[PDB]
Design a protein around this ligand. Structure first.
Ligand SMILES: [Fe+3]
Ligand SMILES: [Fe+3]
Lengths: 569, 565
């Protein structure tokens, strides 16, 4: 166990040892790709899941065998017979928290700020999209108000989710035998726009909340084939929400979860191995936050984004279409890396802590993801800054650290991740820039992945709340809607089962815990910095527990006790 | 990648490097115990399953989710409604090979010699046990012969399986909620005696003659059943199969492959340098062995695990059987070498009649295992000769001498049958030890592990517990009677779950290690072993065209390099 040091501070003997270790690491951590996604060529045994991990994962899979044994769902591509059958899918599993209230408009809307994908909603500035022709009359009928849209917008009261990033998907296909013949079917794609309003009054008892106003299921308006639905539209409104939720779930899995936690971490894990000695302070800082990350990304390669895997079976598009969405989300992230730092990302959507009205109040006061993620972001930043200050007291030490400079060059290179938004001026020159990079990597690996991964079961294991594909077209607005209509839009039995299977496996345990690495730092000064980070997380836990006593609903996913140390499941 | 060498031949500097490695290995491979069974304290990450292993094991578990989705079995402690329902448990899985023919007496008997547990049957010498009062009249009625029992025994025609090792099990209990009421029930244990005869006519094969379901005879409450007893005979075979299945899992499989290997794996780490030739030889045959034994600890022999759920006895009773089986093996280690084990049961290749033909001519486990035993023996002799030429190099190898001391010690495995004269002194003795270890880890484990699905995933052929008492020999047997003896739905499902996971894939392959030997001479000896395995594969393929049913489990292409599943 070596005291960490910068390579230029070491003797020539010690530097030879560092280069030896790096050369060996480069041989063990080679770069590869699947479908243009950067991944590892072969996983080192040191990077495999632990025994303890495997025991927990297996308990999960065996719990699914038991639940399936106790369930009445069948291995068929028929719809369920009754909508109530979706409630019977959990005889031996926890009931998903959304299950009993998912029909409520407020429960729908609050998933934008506290559900699995709190990453889409943005404040409307200036005007709605021209292809989303909501009228004053619609707004006024739904809000029971004489205020106009322009007035609401001028007050910062309107919010939108625009799923146009899904507009080019080729719809996925599926097929099966029924009575000795092959039936071939296609999923139905949608790319909705959803308008929300902040309602300060709430419902008399004055916890304010977001409320949904209008849904246009596809991007190009048409009064007949693509009208705007509102809550006045009865069962047609319920169906419009289903399509919007399906769209949110596709954006969730491809963009917010797979692309922008799991797969954008892969180049950082590999660059750390390919350029940093084992006793490099940055490697020692970052490796606890990479535990099991290569391995879980290899399972995603094998089981999630493979032909016949979960993405192929469950999502709206063809596998090829889903992979294209994933790769475009990676590219935009890497190209703009520092603009995806949490405060900047939120501010770009108009929903950051600085987005306030004339009285200093946030235009979106009820946003548990933002509130709790900012606590964790700020605590990690203090932890990282205090840690790196033990090793870099002056910027020349950044510039003369040949390993660190190689780590940056690897990341920005085309073959190393193409992280062209990583640094300014073509080179890492300051300590504060490195603090921001390492803060963002640790934030993504622990907190961000916890926020998008662990709500999956509560909101997406109950299939009707967020089905990963829709299986019939939106009915015409004047058509009558039966239970059969809804059951034909929702997934068939075998695919509903498959989606529960996925969601349970992704949420069943916590592989590790934020701030609690498997081995202590050798440097007692760094162990003290870590102990203070652990104290701060305890303070943050109690603050969130207090906030949750007053929130409309508790938001538990960013409690530090529930945040892993690494992206690992 | 350093040339292997004996420690006494190394420099002082090399010797201190060897000793540092051994000290680190002792720290990473510490000894521990669960319920008196020797295991590792903490599994080193280097000893974990590989990614590729995990991917295959996960395919197997997901296949069970899919199969269960497509099945109609329920999560209940009720019996199945019809016996035919046991045949509908495999909508998306391979059909177990025994399923169609399991009622046939010949198919029942041939599981003694080609089934999951080919380790029990033995030739009757002198007389039957006194607590098994088979009479001439019974024998003559079953065999439709005038030969007496004593004449048949004198000709070496009779064979027996005696499950007396189960006679003291406390019966397992189970409970469930049924209408806000907690129901508690007990399994029924049995310790049968089964008489077999070799019947030359056909073609020639073993035939079952008589079953007594428990050890103490009584003409009314524990009678001798024969093939003349109709459905009662069918039920007696169920109890005999259940007993074979319990002896299989506790003794032949868990004890005498998985758990007796654990001390050898730990001794190798605790006493041999990484470049010790014996460590280099053995470690390919230990791949994933510590890890699979840790899953056995956690999932198989834990409270609420598979053994607790499925086996006839309480968990404490099954663990006692396991531990007794380990101790007899270790106390008599060299006597469990394949040729000597077969000979002690009267069924070895030397057990021949006046005309030179075996008393038990049809014995695929024996014939194919002997081929692999002999090939491994040549491999380890030719390999070890590269490094030991005279016994003084055996005696002056301090690491090897420590390896033996560790194994025979009370805290390293207590392998008191390992060595003669208190000490390992010859190359041939070490050849015998390493041959047996490699044989157990590959071939023996293959022969007891991979038939589990074909013979035990079809629950009526070999249920791991019985759930009602043997009916009175005079009662009418209904379909419901049999369904109450066989496992309830939930426990049948749990037995299929287990047997599928134990058989889904081959983690590695006999003779094909992950890394080449650095020593080119050792590479050549390994290549010769691979060639011999190819010859054996073709010889077994030829035998399988003349056997009544193929025995595929010891084809070298189906034998792993290590006990790993
Ligand atoms: Fe994840
Ligand atoms: Fe096994």
């Amino acid at each position: 166990m070596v005291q960490p040091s910068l390579p230029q501070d070491d003797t020539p003997d010690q530097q030879e040892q560092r280069n030896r270790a790096i050369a060996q690491q480069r041989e063990a951590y080679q770069y590869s790709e699947t479908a243009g996604i950067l991944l590892i060529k072969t996983l080192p045994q040191s990077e495999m899941f632990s025994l303890k991990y495997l025991i927990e994962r297996d308990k999960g899979l065996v719990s699914l065998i038991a639940n399936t044994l106790a369930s009445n769902i069948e291995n068929i591509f028929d719809p369920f017979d009754k909508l109530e059958d979706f409630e019977e899918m959990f005889p031996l599993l926890p009931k998903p928290l959304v299950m009993n209230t998912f029909r409520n408009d407020r429960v729908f809307a609050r998933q934008r700020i506290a559900g699995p994908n709190p990453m889409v909603i943005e404040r409307v500035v200036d005007k709605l999209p021209d292809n989303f022709p909501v009228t004053d009359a619609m707004f006024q009928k739904i809000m029971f108000t004489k205020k106009t849209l322009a007035e609401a917008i001028a007050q910062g009261k309107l919010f939108i989710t625009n799923y146009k990033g899904l507009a080019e998907l080729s719809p996925g296909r599926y097929e099966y035998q029924k009575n000795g013949t092959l039936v071939q079917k296609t999923k139905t794609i949608a790319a909705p726009l959803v308008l929300y309003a902040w309602k300060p009054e709430g419902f008399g008892d004055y916890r304010g909340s977001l409320a949904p106003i209008a849904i246009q299921i596809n991007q190009q308006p048409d009064p007949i084939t693509n009208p705007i639905y509102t809550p006045r539209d009865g069962k047609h409104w319920f169906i419009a929400k289903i399509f919007a939720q399906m769209a949110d779930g596709n954006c969730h899995e491809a963009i917010s979860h797979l692309a922008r936690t799991h797969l954008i971490l892969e180049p950082f894990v590999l660059a750390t191995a390919n350029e940093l000695a084992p006793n490099h302070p940055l490697s020692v800082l970052l490796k606890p936050h990479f535990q099991f990350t290569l391995a879980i990304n290899e399972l995603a390669r094998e089981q999630l984004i493979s032909a016949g895997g979960y993405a192929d079976d469950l999502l709206a598009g063809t596998l090829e279409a889903s992979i294209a969405v994933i790769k475009a989300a990676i590219k935009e992230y890497m190209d703009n890396f520092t603009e995806f730092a949490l405060p900047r990302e939120l501010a770009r959507r108009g929903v950051g802590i600085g987005d306030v009205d004339q009285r200093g109040e946030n235009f979106l006061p009820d946003y548990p993801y933002r509130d709790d993620a900012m606590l964790l972001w700020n605590a990690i930043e203090v932890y990282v800054r205090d840690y790196l200050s033990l090793y870099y007291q002056s910027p020349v030490q950044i510039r003369q650290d040949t390993e660190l400079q190689n780590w940056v060059r690897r990341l920005v290179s085309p073959e190393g991740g193409r992280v062209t938004g990583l640094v300014s001026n073509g080179e890492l020159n300051t300590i504060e820039a490195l603090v921001a990079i390492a803060t963002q990597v640790i934030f993504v690996s622990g907190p961000q992945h916890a926020a998008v991964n662990y709500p999956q079961y509560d909101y997406m294991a109950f299939i009707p709340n967020m089905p990963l594909a829709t299986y019939a077209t939106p009915p015409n607005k004047e058509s009558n809607i039966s239970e059969a209509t809804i059951l034909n839009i929702l997934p068939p039995q075998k695919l509903a089962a498959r989606q529960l299977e996925l969601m349970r496996t992704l949420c069943v345990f916590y592989p590790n815990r934020l701030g609690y690495p498997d081995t202590e730092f050798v440097d007692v000064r760094a162990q003290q910095v870590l102990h203070q980070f652990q104290e701060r997380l305890q303070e943050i836990e109690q603050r969130i527990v207090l906030c949750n006593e007053k929130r409309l609903e508790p938001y538990t996913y960013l409690l530090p006790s529930n945040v892993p140390n690494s992206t690992s499941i």
